[PDB]
Amino acid sequence: SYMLPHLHNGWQVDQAILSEEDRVVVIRFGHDWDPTCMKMDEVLYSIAEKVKNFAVIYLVDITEVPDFNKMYELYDPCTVMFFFRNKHIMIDLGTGNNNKINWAMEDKQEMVDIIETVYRGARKGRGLVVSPKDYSTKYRY
Amino acid sequence: ANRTVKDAHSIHGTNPQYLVEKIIRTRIYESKYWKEECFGLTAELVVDKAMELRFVGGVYGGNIKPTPFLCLTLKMLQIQPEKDIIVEFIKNEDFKYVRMLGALYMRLTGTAIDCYKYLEPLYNDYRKIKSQNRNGEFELMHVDEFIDELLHSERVCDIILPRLQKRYVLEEAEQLEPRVSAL
Amino acid sequence: KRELLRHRDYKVDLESKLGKTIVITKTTPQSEMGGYYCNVCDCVVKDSINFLDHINGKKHQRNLGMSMRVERSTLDQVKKRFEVNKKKM
Amino acid sequence: KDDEEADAIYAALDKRMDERRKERREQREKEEIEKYRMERPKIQQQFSDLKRKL
Amino acid sequence: AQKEDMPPEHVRKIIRDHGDMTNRKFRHDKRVYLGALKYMPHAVLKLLENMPMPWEQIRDVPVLYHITGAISFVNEIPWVIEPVYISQWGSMWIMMRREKRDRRHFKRMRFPPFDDEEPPLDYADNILDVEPLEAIQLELDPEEDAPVLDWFYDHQPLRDSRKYVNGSTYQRWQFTLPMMSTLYRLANQ
Amino acid sequence: QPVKVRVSYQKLLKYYVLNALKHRPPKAQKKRYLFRSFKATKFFQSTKL
RNA sequence: AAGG
RNA sequence: AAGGUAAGUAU
């Protein structure tokens, strides 16, 4: 949660999105002190080395950097968004919101699969990718 | 354009065009007749288009398609004519449809005093006219029947007319003379 | 110097080219392409309704040195219009 | 300017409507975390002696 | 330093104009307008709790309204003397039972009363002029109902009688035994 | 009496009993009045309608 | 290309 | 009330 790089103003976020031309820019919008953000950041930290070939992970504090709250509807405790070549890559998670991951995941392989799907779809030149797993339900039994 | 002219004042505490439902207003604004022959209309141009009217009605068909009469009514609501212009519309004798358009506008925007002062004298007209039903069919009625519907029916030509103080209520306060019919 | 809005004295031939087929190549500019075109505003519109919206738009009137404001009519000219229309028929 | 004045007036009004039980419930909360804190100390407190030896 | 009451025509004019937000004249200051709109449930609650009773034709209530007409509150709590209120509602019960027995066909109201695209009526030009219809009121015998007859079927009865109430606040009531017996007889149902 | 009105009586009694059990004395508070504070600010005027 |  | 947005390029 604290081992990941941080972006401290909107210009830094724009540059991080613009800098990467061959990798998915995974940016988590939230607060390091929020428990949901702590879970999501732990998951991202567990996979940060694995996906470094095709993904880069940044963390942004939405109070320190409020320049995207109105734009990206960052009014949730945690939010993960995907950008590839200065384009926001939407993902059809099945949750009704195709723009972001607004909850916290528990499986590293889940997040890695989502990142890989986003990377492949964005490389092919697509603005929306279909998630390998549906999230219309939590699969709790 | 599409908005109310700047010099126009509010009617019934709302926008002058708001006397028509937003559904019907949106349908009229998207109609071919409104976009073609009602892009810019002054009182002279409204008079010119009024005589071309062949029927009176609201909307027809399964999809809401407005008649030219409704489009002209909404245009006159948009660009406000003075009261004497409305009277001159009503005072017209050669064309029945122009007088009906003026009477409908007076009922929509005029005071409850005006709705009986200027529309009740039109009961003397019994000219046959064609009225288009909501199914697209046309039916024959008379001028006096249209005036009676204006003065007594809540919804005329798919427009919910503003509330009128009842005639006996107006007579009791004696600010309006009781109607004396010709018969 | 924005003149007040005026009614179009001319009808628009929306249905003039019904059924016709127009051949368009790479060299052909926007002037002779299919659909509706206005030189005043130099644009191509492939609809009758959208063309009516365009010719009723702010930019089209502005390119004509005009304004969306419509002049308030006077009683005398309305009465004279009634008189001349009655005399015509 | 006047927008800020109206916002401040409404905020002060909302704060005043909260004074009915604000101090009572806040002192209850203060006396309730300390009841919970003795049984469940803060994590940093449990490492205070070890941290000092660093 | 106390706020004097405004004439009822002031709020009438304020509501009559500024009706549509489309007007750009008063759009300069909207934080004062918007900030007072969150209390709409309070206005709803105060309005419905001050609803006139079947024995009352017109109920003039103190009104606290925003300076821009954004919201209007009924600044009144419906205090009612419990024996008087119970007796009034018992007489109402008698009247409605007798009306249902007597009237051959009862025409239930049509809900909603008005069309959905019909705008709300202007009070000044539709209700201010028309005289109210007769309310429900049980006939009181001048012989046996004399202790209560004068002030019965009144909004906050005996509000000005310092012998029977503390004052205009309408908090305490001290009633004579004949009035209590008459109210008790009127509320047997 | 019909079954529905008997169930009505029983449900009304259930609500009465539940209200009686769940009753707790009101918590002590400072008297703050919303409408009185409305009158204090200049944004609200008073009338009778 | 048109709408607030 | 939702878990039912194709991603676009043109005008």
- What domain count does chain A have? 1
- Rounded CA-CA distance C30/E2 in Å is 74
| A73: in domain | yes
- Look up tokens 């004062």; give the residue: E32
Tell me the residue length of chain E.
189
Distances (CA, A) of E148 to B129, E95, E185: 65, 18, 11
Its domain, for residue A100, covers: 2-136
Grouping H, G, I as helix, E, B as strand and the rest as coil, residue D29 is helix
Are E6 and F42 a contacting pair at CB < 8 A?
no
Contact E20, B15 (CB under 8 A): yes
Strands B159-160 and B155-156: antiparallel
Cα radius of gyration (chain C)? 18
Which H or E run includes A55? strand A55-61
Neighbours of E177 (CB within 10 A): 8
DSSP string of F1-49, one letter each residue? --HHHHHHHHHHHHHHHHHHHT--PPPP-----HHHHHHHSTTEEEEE-
Q: In B107-166, where do the E strands start and end? A: 128-132, 138-142, 155-156, 159-160
Buried b (16+ CB within 10 A) or exposed e, C52-66: bebbbeeebbeeeeb
Which H or E run includes C51? helix C48-55
Phi and psi torsions of A111, nearest 5°: -65, -35
Mutate to test the interface with F, among E2, E3, E14, E37 (most CBs of F within 10 A): E3
Strand G bases, protein C-beta under 7 A: 1-4
Strands A55-61 and A6-7: parallel
Grouping H, G, I as helix, E, B as strand and the rest as coil, residue C44 is strand
Q: Residue A105 has which token pair?
A: 């995941």
Burial class (CB in 10 A: 0-12, 13-18, 19+), E86: middle
Give the CA-trace dihedral at E85, E87, E89, E90, to 10 degrees: 160
CA angle D28, D30, D35 (to 5 degrees): 90
Distance from the E72 Cα atom to the nearest Cα atom in chain D, whole angstroms: 16
Closest chain C residue to B30 measured between Cα atoms?
C49
| A141: in domain | no
Q: Which residues contact B99 (CB under 8 A, 6 or more apart)?
A: B89, B90, B91, B92, B93, B122, B125, B143
CATH code, domain carrying A67: 3.40.30.10
Which H or E run includes A129? strand A128-130
Q: Which of residues 3-62 of C touch strand H (CB under 7 A)?
A: 43-46, 50
Cα radius of gyration (chain A)? 14
- Look up tokens 């469940």; give the residue: D40
Which residues 9-48 of E are in CB contact (within 8 Å) with F? 10-11, 32, 36, 39, 42
- DSSP state for residue A54 in the 8-state scheme: T
Cis peptide upstream of residue E112 (ω within 30 degrees of 0): yes
| A123: in domain | yes
**Distance in angstroms, CA of B30 to C1' of H11?**
19
- Provide, as residue numbers in chain F, all residues whose Cβ is less than 8 Å from the Cβ of E6: 45-47
**Distance in angstroms, CA of B65 to C1' of H4?**
30
Q: Give which of E124, E125, E157 is closest to E11, Cα–Cα.
A: E124
A126 CB below 7 A from strand H atoms = yes
- Rounded CA-CA distance A3/A43 in Å is 12
Q: Give which of B75, B80, B76, B58 is closest to B67, Cα–Cα.
A: B58
Question: Which of D3, D9, D10 comes nearest E29 by C-beta?
Answer: D3
CA angle B58, B62, B68 (to 5 degrees): 30
- Rounded CA-CA distance B66/B70 in Å is 6
Q: Residue A137 has which token pair?
A: 């339900």
Contact B24, B58 (CB under 8 A): yes
Which H or E run includes A104? none
Q: State the amino acid at position F23 in one-letter form.
A: H
- Rounded CA-CA distance B41/B47 in Å is 9
Technique that determined the structure: cryo-EM
Quick one: resolution in A? 3.1
- Rounded CA-CA distance B33/B73 in Å is 13
Q: Which of residues 8-37 of C touch strand G (CB under 7 A)?
A: none
DSSP bridge partners of E72: E65
DSSP string of B15-40, one letter each residue? -GGGGS-HHHHHHHHTSHHHHHH-SS
Positive or negative, the CA dihedral B9, B11, B17, B18 is positive
Q: How far apart are the first and last CA of chain E?
A: 50
- Rounded CA-CA distance C49/C53 in Å is 6
Q: Residue A77 has which token pair?
A: 């405790």
Q: Which residues contact B57 (CB under 8 A, 6 or more apart)?
A: B67, B69, B70, B131, B132, B133, B134, B157, B158
DSSP bridge partners of B59: B66
Distances (CA, A) of C14 to B36, C36, C63, E75, E162: 10, 8, 21, 63, 84
**Distance in angstroms, CA of E186 to C1' of H4?**
62
Which residues 24-43 of B are in CB contact (within 8 Å) with C? 30, 32, 35-36, 39-43
Contact B56, B97 (CB under 8 A): yes
Contact C70, C5 (CB under 8 A): yes
Which H or E run includes B122? none
Distance from the C27 Cα atom to the nearest Cα atom in chain B, whole angstroms: 33
Give the CA-trace dihedral at D23, D25, D30, D34, to 10 degrees: 160
Distances (CA, A) of E165 to B174, C17, E172, E180: 44, 89, 6, 14
SS3 for chain E is: CCCCCCCHHHHHHHHHCCCCCCCCCCCCCCHHHHHCCCCHHHHHHHHHHCCCCCCCCCCCCEEEEECCCCCEEECCCCCCCHHHHHHHHHHHHHHHHHHHHHCCCCCCCCCCCCCCCCCCCCHHHHCCCCCCCCCCCCCCCCCCCHHHHCCCCCCCCCCCCCCCECCCCCCCECCCHHHHHHHHHHCCC
Q: Residue B67 has which token pair?
A: 């008649």
Chains in touch with F (≥3 Cβ pairs < 8 A): D, E
**Distance in angstroms, CA of B48 to C1' of G2?**
27
